[PDB]
């Protein structure tokens, strides 16, 4: 029903989580601690989670790899995306780094080609406006 | 739906068809695109799966001994090429098919001639 | 708004209509143009309205030419009077259009927007017209 | 509903037809349905 992103470092963020998924009837109190215990080794890196709830609100949390935007921008050090994607340069990235991010994301991707996922991440970067080569 | 691309698709099919020592043709009607990921991860040691358009596969079937599968070119084509021999890949292809139930093996080809589903499954289980 | 700055005679016979245009029948200044299929007396008011229509449709560029000019004088007698006492004073200015003669010319990169502007203009006009272009 | 001698499919959903000898328009939005007369 709901899929958001959260960083293992903390829990129960007000705007991102407060009115986001608690609105749909999710046991945030237990879910946040379960997610933290499951993925605390990642420290403060944001990680995507998708919640599957049953009739009785019994919940299961599925984890995916950290966002490709963060993986592309942190290397240069910028912690945010392009305000006007493709219009303002924000960082520089290498083709090897793009392919490594693609291989990491292949779990997130629905894809089965590593080079094609590399193309995926190259698009994901240059559309924001990041030099890729 | 392209015409000039007919020859390109036929050539791309035929090159890998001859490169593969043996090939098996199935219908994959039922599996979400994701399940192909697990299928390829399981068969990556000895075989590779790929989809194709029967409209051109039938035309290309006259190049080699897959002509015996003329009656079998129905449903959504799924070629599971095997690098070498047929058992090495069949032993896993048959088990994955029996598990997921989204694949039905209908034809095969080896030694320049077609072999029946019974032959393919016997090689798989042997 | 177009008005001849001077005219040798200010009270002329009615421009005759019969015949087909022997000149000005080929678009020459722009990509598309408006051709006329029947006679009329296009006046400066209608010409100005059609021009405003085209310019307001395009809104940012292109170029428009008016291959016709209203210069023939036409006079109406004073209101509520009888027959006699000479011709009236010149009130409205018309151009004697004939079938074939091209009226407006337009050059704009976008073919469909150009056609739309030309359609708006032909609607504002009082005559049956059609869009044509340079090619045979 | 509108009744004008000019009927226009004023949006992508609008559909023109000829019913009982009279043209008209239908749309998922009743604001647009109109007849020719």
């Amino acid at each position: 029903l709901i899929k958001l992103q959260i960083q293992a470092g903390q829990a129960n963020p007000a705007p991102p989580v407060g009115p986001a998924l608690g609105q749909h009837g999710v046991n945030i109190m237990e879910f946040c601690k379960a997610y933290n215990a499951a993925t605390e080794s990642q420290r403060g890196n944001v990680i995507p989670v998708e919640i599957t709830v049953y009739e009785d609100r019994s919940f299961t949390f599925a984890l995916k790899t950290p966002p490709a935007a963060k993986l592309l921008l942190k290397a240069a050090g910028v912690q945010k995306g392009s305000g006007e994607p493709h219009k303002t340069k924000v960082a520089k990235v290498t083709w090897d780094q793009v392919r490594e991010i693609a291989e990491t994301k292949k779990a997130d991707l629905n894809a089965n080609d590593i080079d094609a996922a590399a193309k995926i991440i190259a698009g994901t970067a240059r559309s924001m406006g990041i030099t890729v080569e | 739906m392209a015409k000039a691309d007919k020859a390109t698709a036929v050539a791309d099919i035929a090159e890998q068809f001859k490169a593969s020592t043996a090939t098996v043709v199935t219908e994959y009607r039922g599996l979400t695109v994701a399940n192909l990921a697990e299928l390829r991860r399981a068969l990556g040691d000895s075989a590779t799966y790929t989809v194709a358009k029967n409209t051109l596969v039938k035309r290309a079937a006259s190049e080699a001994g897959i002509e015996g599968l003329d009656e079998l070119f129905a449903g959504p084509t799924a070629i599971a090429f095997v690098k070498g021999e047929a058992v090495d890949a069949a032993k896993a292809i048959k088990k994955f098919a029996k598990d997921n139930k989204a694949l039905v093996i209908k034809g095969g080809y080896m030694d320049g001639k077609a072999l029946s589903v019974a032959d393919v499954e016997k090689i798989a289980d042997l | 708004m177009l008005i001849p700055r001077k005219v040798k005679h200010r009270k002329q016979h009615h421009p005759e209509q019969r015949g087909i245009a022997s000149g000005g029948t080929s678009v020459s200044f722009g990509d598309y143009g408006i051709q006329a299929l029947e006679h009329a007396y296009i006046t400066n008011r209608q010409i100005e309205s059609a021009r405003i229509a085209i310019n307001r449709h395009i809104k940012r560029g292109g170029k428009v030419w008016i291959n016709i000019f209203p210069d023939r004088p036409l006079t109406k007698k004073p209101a509520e009077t009888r027959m006699g006492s000479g011709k009236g004073s010149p009130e409205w200015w018309v151009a004697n259009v004939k079938p074939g003669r091209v009226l407006f010319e337009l050059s704009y990169p976008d073919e469909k927007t150009a056609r739309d502007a030309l359609t708006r203009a032909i609607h504002k006009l009082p005559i049956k017209a059609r869009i044509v272009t340079r090619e045979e | 509903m509108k009744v004008n001698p000019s009927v226009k499919p004023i949006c992508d959903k609008c559909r023109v037809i000829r019913r009982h000898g009279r043209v008209m328009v239908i749309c998922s939005d009743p604001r647009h349905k109109q007849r020719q007369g």
């Binding site: 007000a14 407060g18 009115p19 986001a20 609105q23 749909h24 | - | 004073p78 009236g88 | -």
Partner: protein, 430 residues
């Protein structure tokens, strides 16, 4: 036919009361209006009298002097700083041998020139012909055009049956016919728009109306606060059709800025009836922004003009006076003492440069605080499952303090009475 054409101008004015400053300002604004109409000002004559000249608005010797002046300058029109009778018009015409136009006729022709669409054409035509009827004899002797003729009236031997004489055709007969029909539509459009104005009133959305002097930045304030561009400003030396658009206060609460036509000293009442279309906006308005040019050295004249017109309008419907915010625009044009000469008399006015927004922050704060919010101050705590209610608070509500706790979202906000009743259960003071 029957139009107006100040070809070139030679102003004439009579100083009856007040001061030479008042007389010169009046004649100068008259010249400004004439220039706007297009005539070129050649010279401006002023005659000082204790009371007007009910003969021809000036002395006979002065009229002869003006005839000589006009012949010498080759002028074509004489514009008089006043509203005069047909007899005075005819006297001046026979003294000067040229077309003679007045302030009222000039303003009416300016309106005819400006008006583009809407009911404005009908309003202008009715005002012009209602002003022409009293001067039907004056303008009717200063015909102009006409194509000459001879009488134009000869039926025939009557016998036992008088001429049809059911003349339903006359100068204004149509104007009369027309306006009689078109008043109904004037009211109907008002009412159909009011159908939604009532819903605007249902919400906190208040009505704010700009009351300003003609060509007094009246559209600059709109383009500064609302931001929306206004075609030809929809506000200038003479606009007819008022406009309006939805802006926001200092706090954020929505409202409508209503740009309206400016005013002139003693605007002809024939046009105050067309102004009614924008001057019911003053009664509808929750707030009034009284704008005045900052470069003026005698602001009080225009201030009193606007005040008296608005008083005349309000007296009709006995509506309580709305809040009034005095605004001085184009402030940079004057000196410090130039601003002081206005500030000392009227210190509460806010001086804002619409060209750059200097002080616009204080202007927004003042107007937002003057337009008191029609909300309710409510503190509440709602569980996390009511994220939709928190979203509705964000959308329609007025958040003052939003925080979160395990129990729910502690929100202190100003909210409408319906929603306050809806979520009264979780109120801290339940």
């Amino acid at each position: 036919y029957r139009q107006l054409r100040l070809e070139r101008v030679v102003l004439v004015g009579v100083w009856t009361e007040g001061s030479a400053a008042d007389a010169e300002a009046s004649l100068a604004e008259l010249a400004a209006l004439a220039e706007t109409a297009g005539s070129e000002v050649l010279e401006g004559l002023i005659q000082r009298r204790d009371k007007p000249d009910p003969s021809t608005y000036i002395g006979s010797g002065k009229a002869a002097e003006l005839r000589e002046v006009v012949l010498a300058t080759g002028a074509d029109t004489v514009i008089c700083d006043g509203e005069l009778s047909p007899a005075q018009l005819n006297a001046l015409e026979k003294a000067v041998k040229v077309k003679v136009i007045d302030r009222t006729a000039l303003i009416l022709d300016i309106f005819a020139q400006h008006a583009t669409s809407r009911e404005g054409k009908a309003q202008v035509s009715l005002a012009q012909m209602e002003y022409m009827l009293p001067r039907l004899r004056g303008w009717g002797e200063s015909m102009s055009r006409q194509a000459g003729g001879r009488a134009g009236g000869a039926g025939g031997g009557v016998g036992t049956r008088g001429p049809g004489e059911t003349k339903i055709e006359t100068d204004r007969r149509r104007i009369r016919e027309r306006m009689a029909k078109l008043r109904r539509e004037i009211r109907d459009m008002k009412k159909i728009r009011d159908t939604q104005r009532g819903s605007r009133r249902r919400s906190e959305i208040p009505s704010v109306a700009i009351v300003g002097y003609t060509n007094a930045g009246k559209s600059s304030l709109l383009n500064a606060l609302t931001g929306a561009g206004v075609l030809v400003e929809n506000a200038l030396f003479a606009t007819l059709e008022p406009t309006t658009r939805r802006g926001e206060f200092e706090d954020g609460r929505p409202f409508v800025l209503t740009d309206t036509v400016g005013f002139v000293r003693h605007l002809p009442t024939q046009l105050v009836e067309a102004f009614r279309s924008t001057l019911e906006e003053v009664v509808d308005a929750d707030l009034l922004i009284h704008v005045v040019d900052g470069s003026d050295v005698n602001p009080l004249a225009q201030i009193n003009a606007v005040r008296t017109v608005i008083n005349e309008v309000v007296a009709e419907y006995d509506i309580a006076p709305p809040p009034e915010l005095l605004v001085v625009n184009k402030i940079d044009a004057a000196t410090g003492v130039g601003l002081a000469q206005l500030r000392r008399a009227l210190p509460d006015a806010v001086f804002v440069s619409a060209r750059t927004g200097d002080g616009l922050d204080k202007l927004r704060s003042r107007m937002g605080e003057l337009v008191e919010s029609t909300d309710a101050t409510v503190d509440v705590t709602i569980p996390y499952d009511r994220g939709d209610l928190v979203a509705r608070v964000h959308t329609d509500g007025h958040v003052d303090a939003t925080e979160h706790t395990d129990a729910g979202t502690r929100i202190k906000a100003r909210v409408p009475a319906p929603l306050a009743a809806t979520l009264r259960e979780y109120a801290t003071f339940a």
